[PDB]
Design a protein around this ligand. Structure first.
Ligand SMILES: COC(=O)N1CCN(c2ccc(F)cc2)CC1
Length: 185
C-alpha cells in the first residue's frame, strides 16, 4: 500500500474510556488497570468492555494511522460511528456502527456479522488502519509483514462522523496487560 502519506496524529479521549483504563499523559497509549481508576461516571464511557475512542472525528477524506499490539493476547481495533452505544452488551458489527478486526484465543477475525476468519501467516506487532470516507472503505494492514493486506470492508455505510476505536481486552489470564500504543508518523 501507499497510504502512509494520509497519516493523521490520533490521540485518545479520556472521557470515553472505560473507568479501569489508564491513558498516558501524551494520550498516545492505553492499558488495562488492575482496578477502577478513580474517575467519575458519564454517559460517554464504555461500561461493559475495556474500550476507548480517539478524540478525532472524520466526515471526509482519507486517513491512516498505526497501532502497536506487541505481546497482547486479545484486542479490537478499527473505527466506529460517533453515535455507537456506550452502555450494556453489544456485538462489534457494521449494523451497530463498528468496522473492526480483533485477536481472540490465537485467531484473528473481522467484525462482520457473523465474524470472518482472517488468514495471517506473520502475527502482527503493528496494525495499519486506512479509512476512505467517500469510497466507503476501511482497510487493515500487517506492518510486521511489509504492509500486507489483512482485510477490507467495502460498501461501508458510515452514516455519521467516524472515530478511531480501541479495545485493550480483559486480562483474566495475566498475559494481556500490555498497552495499545499509537505509533509515531
Ligand atoms: C506498570 O506497567 C505495567 O504494568 N505495564 C503492563 C505491561 N507492559 C508491557 C508492555 C509491552 C509488552 F510487550 C508487554 C507488557 C508495560 C506496562
Amino acid at each position: 500500500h501507499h497510504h502512509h502519506h494520509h497519516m493523521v496524529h490520533i490521540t485518545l479521549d479520556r472521557n470515553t474510556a472505560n473507568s479501569w483504563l489508564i491513558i498516558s499523559k501524551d494520550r498516545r497509549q492505553v492499558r488495562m488497570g488492575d482496578t477502577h481508576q478513580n474517575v467519575s461516571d458519564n454517559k460517554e464511557r464504555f461500561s461493559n468492555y475495556p474500550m476507548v475512542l480517539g478524540a478525532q472525528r472524520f466526515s471526509s477524506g482519507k486517513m491512516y494511522w498505526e497501532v502497536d499490539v506487541t505481546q497482547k493476547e486479545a484486542w479490537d481495533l478499527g473505527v466506529c460511528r460517533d453515535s455507537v452505544q456506550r452502555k450494556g452488551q453489544f456485538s462489534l458489527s457494521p449494523e451497530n456502527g463498528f468496522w473492526t478486526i480483533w485477536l481472540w484465543q490465537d485467531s484473528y477475525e473481522a467484525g462482520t456479522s457473523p465474524q470472518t476468519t482472517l488468514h495471517i501467516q506473520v502475527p502482527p506487532c503493528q496494525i495499519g488502519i486506512f479509512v476512505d470516507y467517500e469510497a466507503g472503505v476501511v482497510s487493515f494492514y500487517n506492518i510486521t509483514d511489509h504492509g500486507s493486506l489483512i482485510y477490507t470492508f467495502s460498501e461501508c455505510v458510515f452514516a455519521g462522523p467516524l472515530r478511531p476505536f480501541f479495545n485493550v481486552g480483559f486480562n483474566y489470564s495475566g498475559g494481556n496487560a500490555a498497552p495499545l500504543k499509537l505509533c509515531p508518523l
